[PDB]
Amino acid sequence: VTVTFIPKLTGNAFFESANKGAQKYSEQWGFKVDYEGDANASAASQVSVINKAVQQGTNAICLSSVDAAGVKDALKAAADAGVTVTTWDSDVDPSVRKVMVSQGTPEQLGQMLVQMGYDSLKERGKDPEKDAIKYCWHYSNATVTDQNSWQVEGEKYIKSKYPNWQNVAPDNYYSNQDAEQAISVGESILSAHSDIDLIICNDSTALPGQAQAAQNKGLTAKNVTITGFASPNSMKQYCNDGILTRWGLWDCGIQGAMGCYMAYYIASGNSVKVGDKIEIPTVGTVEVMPNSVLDPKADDSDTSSGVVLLPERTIFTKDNMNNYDF
């Protein structure tokens, strides 16, 4: 069996680390993972990668989507060619994939982002419980499924728990997963909103780009609070240089491996339904959940379509970041 493992883009540390995990585990499990993507985060590029993998006779795809709508037709065609379709990281329409391996619910992840920001704000001498904290979100793009679901839940949480906070840029800032653009956009936020208190960077490119922008402006964690999601090796130097205090992620290597395992398990002829408990060798037992764990409006009618959730997420600071190497 070959699983084609497709990232939102290659050459970003989150996706490279996820593939390192998929490669390590699939070698032990006895199947091939073909890592295929593009340097740009582009739905049209992902369609081309999907089509080429189908044409080459891949048995399965495990995809993290930059835009669900833009890959729907290609994934329907993949399934009609006999290819098992799964997702990880950022989902698509659940009617066109079997299992999604997700890092957490949008409520969990949106609240985690806000809580990291709250903690870092308090540590630089603000009173986030009461202050009119000025903030905004900086991430990849306005349509991707994962990051927008977190923004929606994080905004609901802020408006409920911290009504005094002020979103100074409600349209959000977008840097398209382009490393150089994330720096430039990070600089734009700090120039146009120079008194901003918190920038929530729920994207693995926006977070290091925003930290670099702050460093370019001579700022440290004492001036402005930046938090978000990124693999820890990409942020250690910024943290050692005092640019930010705290950010988060989860075990993206095991996540990529799990997504590829689910694709292999189904492509090998095993049926998977919501409620099943599946023993993934050397990882543990997972439970397939209904699609509505990621969106309460999701249709749960098809029990062959479901979600596996990672059991934990990770908050990094200078005190634990050196325990990790990805």
Q: Contact residues for ligand PAV (CB under 6 A)? A: 8, 14, 64, 89-90, 146-147, 202-204, 229
Q: Least distance from C-beta 250 to ligand PAV, angstroms?
A: 8
C-alpha 81, offset from chain centre: 28
Q: Least distance from C-beta 206 to ligand PAV, angstroms?
A: 8
- Within a 13 Å sphere around the CA of 140, how many CA atoms are in the beta-carbon half? 27
Q: Between 112 and 221, whose beta carbon lies closer to ligand PAV? A: 112
Q: Least distance from C-beta 14 to ligand PAV, angstroms?
A: 4
Q: Between 67 and 197, whose beta carbon lies closer to ligand PAV? A: 67
Q: How far is CA 292 from CA 193, 274, 310, in A?
A: 37, 11, 16
Tokens of 17: 């680390």
Q: Between 29 and 173, whose beta carbon lies closer to ligand PAV? A: 173
Q: Between 1 and 41, whose beta carbon lies closer to ligand PAV? A: 41
Q: Between 58 and 202, whose beta carbon lies closer to ligand PAV? A: 202
Q: Between 90 and 151, whose beta carbon lies closer to ligand PAV? A: 90
Cα distance from N-terminal residue to C-terminal residue, the chain: 27
Q: In this structure, what are the phi and psi dihedrals at residue 64, rounded to the nearest 5 degrees? A: -105, 115
Q: Least distance from C-beta 78 to ligand PAV, angstroms?
A: 21
- Residue 325: CB atoms within 10 A of its CB come to 9
DSSP state of 233: G
Q: How far is CA 96 from CA 5, 73, 283, in A?
A: 16, 9, 26
Tokens of 316: 């990094």
**Residue keyed to tokens 């379509």:** 305
Task: State how far the Cα of 54 lies from the Cα of 59, in Å rounded to an integer.
Answer: 8
Q: Between 59 and 65, whose beta carbon lies closer to ligand PAV? A: 65
In terms of DSSP bridges, do strands 314-316 and 134-139 run parallel, antiparallel, or are they unpaired?
unpaired
Q: Between 274 and 310, whose beta carbon lies closer to ligand PAV? A: 310
* Cβ pair 97, 68 in contact under 8 A: no
Q: Least distance from C-beta 195 to ligand PAV, angstroms?
A: 26
Measured from each CB, the residue nearest to ligand PAV is 204
Q: Least distance from C-beta 200 to ligand PAV, angstroms?
A: 11
Q: Between 252 and 289, whose beta carbon lies closer to ligand PAV? A: 252
> What are the CB-based long-range contacts (under 8 Å, 24+) for 141-144?
141/41, 141/66, 141/67, 141/174, 141/176, 141/177, 142/172, 142/174, 143/67, 143/68, 143/69, 144/8, 144/65, 144/66, 144/67, 144/68, 144/90
In terms of DSSP bridges, do strands 2-6 and 60-63 run parallel, antiparallel, or are they unpaired?
parallel
Q: Least distance from C-beta 291 to ligand PAV, angstroms?
A: 18
**Residue keyed to tokens 């290091």:** 208
Q: Least distance from C-beta 18 to ligand PAV, angstroms?
A: 9
DSSP state of 101: E
Q: Least distance from C-beta 147 to ligand PAV, angstroms?
A: 5
